[PDB]
Design an enzyme around this catalytic site. Sequence first.
Site, PDB file in Angstrom:
ATOM      1  N   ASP A  52       9.761  -6.768   0.169  1.00  0.00           N
ATOM      2  CA  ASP A  52       7.999  -6.705   0.181  1.00  0.00           C
ATOM      3  C   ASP A  52       7.240  -5.119  -1.043  1.00  0.00           C
ATOM      4  OD1 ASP A  52       5.663  -7.688  -0.070  1.00  0.00           O
ATOM      5  OD2 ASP A  52       5.012  -7.511   2.329  1.00  0.00           O
ATOM      6  N   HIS A  53       5.754  -5.907  -1.342  1.00  0.00           N
ATOM      7  CA  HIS A  53       5.409  -3.930  -1.046  1.00  0.00           C
ATOM      8  C   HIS A  53       4.805  -3.518   0.358  1.00  0.00           C
ATOM      9  CE1 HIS A  53       5.096  -6.407  -5.187  1.00  0.00           C
ATOM     10  NE2 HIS A  53       5.459  -5.641  -5.427  1.00  0.00           N
ATOM     11  N   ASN A  77       2.759 -10.009   2.106  1.00  0.00           N
ATOM     12  CA  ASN A  77       2.842 -11.655   1.856  1.00  0.00           C
ATOM     13  C   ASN A  77       3.693 -11.645   0.210  1.00  0.00           C
ATOM     14  OD1 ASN A  77       1.339 -11.856   3.917  1.00  0.00           O
ATOM     15  ND2 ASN A  77      -0.445 -11.142   2.202  1.00  0.00           N
ATOM     16  N   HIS A  78       3.954 -10.651  -0.634  1.00  0.00           N
ATOM     17  CA  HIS A  78       5.285 -10.910  -1.511  1.00  0.00           C
ATOM     18  C   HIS A  78       6.701 -10.814  -1.347  1.00  0.00           C
ATOM     19  CE1 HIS A  78       1.938  -8.482  -3.463  1.00  0.00           C
ATOM     20  NE2 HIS A  78       1.235 -10.111  -2.721  1.00  0.00           N
ATOM     21  N   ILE A  79       7.505 -11.897  -0.745  1.00  0.00           N
ATOM     22  CA  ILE A  79       8.768 -12.063  -0.564  1.00  0.00           C
ATOM     23  C   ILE A  79       9.717 -12.569  -1.795  1.00  0.00           C
ATOM     24  CG2 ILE A  79       9.907 -12.813   1.393  1.00  0.00           C
ATOM     25  CD1 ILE A  79       7.493 -14.122   2.318  1.00  0.00           C
TER      26      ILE A  79
END
Lengths: 413, 540, 136
Positions: free
Chosen positions: B321-322, B475-477
């Site tokens: 993720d970030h 939320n960037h899986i």
Amino acid sequence: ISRGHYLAIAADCAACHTNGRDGQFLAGGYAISSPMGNIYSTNITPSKTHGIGNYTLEQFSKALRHGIRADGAQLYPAMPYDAYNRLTDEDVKSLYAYIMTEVKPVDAPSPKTQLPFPFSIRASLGIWKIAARIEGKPYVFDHTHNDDWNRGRYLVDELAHCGECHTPRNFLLAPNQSAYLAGADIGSWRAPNITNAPQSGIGSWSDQDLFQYLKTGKTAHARAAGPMAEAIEHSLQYLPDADISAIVTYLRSVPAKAESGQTVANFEHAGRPSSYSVANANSRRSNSTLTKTTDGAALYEAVCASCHQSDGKGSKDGYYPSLVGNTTTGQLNPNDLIASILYGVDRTTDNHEILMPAFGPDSLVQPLTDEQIATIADYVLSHFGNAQATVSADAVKQVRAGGKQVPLAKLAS
Amino acid sequence: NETLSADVVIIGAGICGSLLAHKLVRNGLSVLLLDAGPRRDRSQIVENWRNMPPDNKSQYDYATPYPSVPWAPHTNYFPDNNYLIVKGPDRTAYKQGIIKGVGGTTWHWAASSWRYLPNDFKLHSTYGVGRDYAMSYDELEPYYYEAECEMGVMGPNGEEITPSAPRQNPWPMTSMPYGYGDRTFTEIVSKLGFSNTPVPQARNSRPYDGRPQCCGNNNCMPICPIGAMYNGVYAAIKAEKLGAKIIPNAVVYAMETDAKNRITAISFYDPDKQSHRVVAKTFVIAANGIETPKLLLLAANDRNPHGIANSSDLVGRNMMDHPGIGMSFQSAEPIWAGGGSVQMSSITNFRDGDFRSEYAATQIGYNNTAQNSRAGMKALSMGLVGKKLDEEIRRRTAHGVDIYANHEVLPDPNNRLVLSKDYKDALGIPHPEVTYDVGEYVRKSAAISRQRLMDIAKAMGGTEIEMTPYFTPNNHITGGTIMGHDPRDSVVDKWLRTHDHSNLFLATGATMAASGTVNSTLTMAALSLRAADAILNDLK
Amino acid sequence: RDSISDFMQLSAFATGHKNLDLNIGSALLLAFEAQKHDFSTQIKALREHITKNNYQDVEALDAAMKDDPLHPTLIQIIRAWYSGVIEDETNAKVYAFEKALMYQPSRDVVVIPTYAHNGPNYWVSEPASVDVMPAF
Ligand SMILES: Cc1cc2nc3c(=O)[nH]c(=O)nc-3n(C[C@H](O)[C@H](O)[C@H](O)COP(=O)(O)OP(=O)(O)OC[C@H]3O[C@@H](n4cnc5c(N)ncnc54)[C@H](O)[C@@H]3O)c2cc1C
Ligand code: HEC
Ligand code: HEC
Ligand code: HEC
Ligand code: F3S
């Protein structure tokens, strides 16, 4: 632009012979929803193979003013030759020159119009023309009126053919010249009364408001949608200010036709100072895909209150119109309100695009059922528009189907 | 349900799954779209958010407006519903938000559509860290543009913002003008040496796709009331209009493989735990970077005892993720957040460089969400009364600033998504469980990002400065089903087809071999369209 | 209607703003009475304090009631009118949004999110001064 180009813009002859935004212009292929079925506009580009490039001046005049093809076949009255009939010979010649010399040929045949029996044979249209009383002496100036009135009448009747949509049709789908410009249903839409009746028509409109609406389609009380948006964005925004002024001058002299049950003008309905309840919505949390929301105020707040405010007065800069004092919500016939909810608004003027999203079954933002649309329309009518008007789910379904079916269409069953 | 046959069955009606389904039905294929969550109405979500408490608005609650269904629950962090268990030193950084239903998580995203840099596709080849993608930027560029055109992405068309992703065509729309806060932030951080540039957004700067122009409702997270931004439900609706069949509340739980390890059928549950079998020529899992590995591990066969497509023992590993550091303060000068969308610009200065061999590249951004709810709640908490209360509310909404710094995490095999042995849901399926560690790469990046955020706060004269002592989720899986050329070191290939099963494609962000620096859903959509090309070539 | 009238008068005094929605006030009074059974007598006591001591505004009443047991309920009334909620949970009922008094001091500049300010590009204009309280 040339005189022929100006006449083609004024007559909006390219709004039907161009199939939408794409479909290189004047190539035909545009489907017109007539009561009897779909009628396709033909190729008018000067292609000697697929267009009208082999037409002579007399053949072009016959097709334009009398509805007789080069072959001798009768043209369907979806082409407004009944309005173009009284065009002067000079204007017909200018249009012919513009077609022959200024529009690029397109070598692509258009879909052929197939109509159900007994309308498939385009030879009974001679008797229909005899019954319609189309002819039709070429227009000459009335010398009791001034030149502005005559030019406005010519623009309204022969070029812009307003009565094609605003004059109701009789049983035989012919113009009813008794009810001139008195409002008509033209499918899913209704062209309202535009006679000088102060309450029924546009008689109480200010001159500046009428001019601004005809030029741009936008006014504090009226916004052009459906066929009106297309007419303005394809023909009326390009007309000179003298043309719009002459149209207004003539329109102010059109004899009044009254509507039944009208006491105030469509733009003169005040708004009820009433709204929804935020508290009552608390029970509807944890209730995704609203089906238990049957309140009209709650539905309006959920689907509509973002742009048009909760009081129904729109935004301060006027981008989102006020539903209070609006000619669409103020009509006793709620057809246009239903059509606006079902299809939204889309109008490009001066290369700037108005858009209200559609809310019908095919909507991307929020599809609504006939019952939800009827509930929202009833709330809007009671609180912001004509309180004497009502909407039911069957009315929404009928507007979705393309309007009420004319009795003549029953013959093709 | 008897057999539910189709040419291709896609599991998950998110942006990836719906875009794939639309491209497949547009090309003459029969498509079965399955989603574990329900059908949702935008206006109902709007009403739910409006009736959500103001403290849930001030603190960014993006999940409450979407009700969670017991058969396919999603994450909620006002009070935490414990659907996603997170462990490890940096567990707080994987407390991510997902939404389940037709439309998916893009129902409530910010719609920041980003193209990755070319170097982002060859990170290990360029800097010696992380992993290289199975394909290059040039191979994904046409699909990048196709996704941008379908989604309606606006961007800074005439602008040399910084070294960024090279484009062959301009953006379908040009970026809408900045609000006051974005202009002020741009000038301030330009004086600070940072380059604040417009964010490419799937938002309408003009009427587009029959949808309205953005009026600045400033509620992109968690719901646009008017559809002026892209949601994957658009692609789902368009696919269904073209003949695709959609079954909501279809929680896929089982897969069957034949002697060639090709998938022959899948089995899903309804809300009542009734099992339905589905047979297709091609199977696609487009569920999540979390739900796809969970489905792969849960569907372990006798032929695949460790999980579907897990011959490399990499399914669920390399979860990325970030990682983010948040800051909030009161600016000395008014900033007036709330003009335009919630995320209009970001500092793209440090997206690339030679430092990326030592520590992570980062993205510094300013939050444009209106601070009126936060100001009101805070001023009420101070016990103010009368005119002082109104003055405090006005000053705090004019002066409140939220700032963030997101980092890039390397793929770590011990960042895993095993199935939980302690928690289950109504259908008895185990809860996902992620063990997360950010790594010295991100810790060294954060030692610098913290100073950068402090410099930003000082340049604005900020008071009441508050930093998160922990890392935050973004939320960037990505990762979990890693892509590559070696079947012994990856789950899928450059066409997103699994190495173990030639029948199976995984259209998800879990395929991405690097996390990059910016939001990753546009890369997901481009990869989904690439997989659509591969599937079409397979079936025709 | 005596209870509603007294609640609305005391609310107009406590919030300092005369124009308060009667439906929101009625819902707030019903919720306050459901939560506390003796809310009406406390309202009457606060109004008696105001009339007896002749307090001109809520500032003086708050200053002179900093320890009296009717301070919490007055602060609760103010909080309910401004925030739109009475409780402190994530499932607390919301009685006012876009009409809550805490969104009003910035309405001339800042969007109340799910409702539009005037126009799809209004934010190109310069904002108003922070020192000018708008309205209401
Ligand atoms: C608040 C927020 C803001 C964001 N902002 C941005 C942003 O600005 N830019 C950006 O690029 N990204 C952003 N994202 C991330 C973005 O939302 C996701 O990357 C995107 O939704 C991609 O998800 P997906 O399509 O792979 O699957 P999803 O849409 O997450 O899920 C697809 C579907 O799979 C279904 N499913 C799951 N398991 C099963 C199963 N077993 N059987 C059947 N169906 C199943 C689910 O019900 C779901 O509907 C944001 C996310 C959040 C939470
Ligand atoms: C939700 C249920 C509704 C309802 C009942 C209406 N709208 Fe809108 N609307 C919008 C815009 C921009 C226009 C006009 C176009 C422009 O001037 O460029 C309209 C128009 C209408 C009308 C009729 C006006 C006319 O005279 O034709 C009516 C009756 C109407 N609307 C009702 C904008 C929006 C939205 C923008 C985000 C949304 C949502 C809605 N409208 C939704 C609704
Ligand atoms: C040609 C010269 C004209 C002129 C002067 C007008 N029209 Fe039309 N019109 C059409 C429709 C469907 C509508 C209403 C749409 C809705 O329901 O939202 C209108 C509206 C008008 C008005 C406004 C009246 C009001 O009170 O709303 C006016 C002043 C007006 N028109 C004048 C349909 C058509 C056409 C369809 C084919 C054509 C041609 C015209 N109109 C042409 C004209
Ligand atoms: C503005 C100048 C204008 C010109 C010149 C014009 N039209 Fe047509 N036109 C048609 C239709 C429909 C037909 C064919 C129907 C028929 O066969 O009865 C047609 C037929 C014709 C034909 C017959 C040639 C052929 O191949 O069928 C010519 C020529 C023509 N139109 C020219 C709809 C329109 C509409 C509809 C809104 C407008 C406006 C319109 N036409 C405006 C114009
Ligand atoms: S909520 Fe919608 S109106 Fe614009 S600011 Fe976000 S896309």
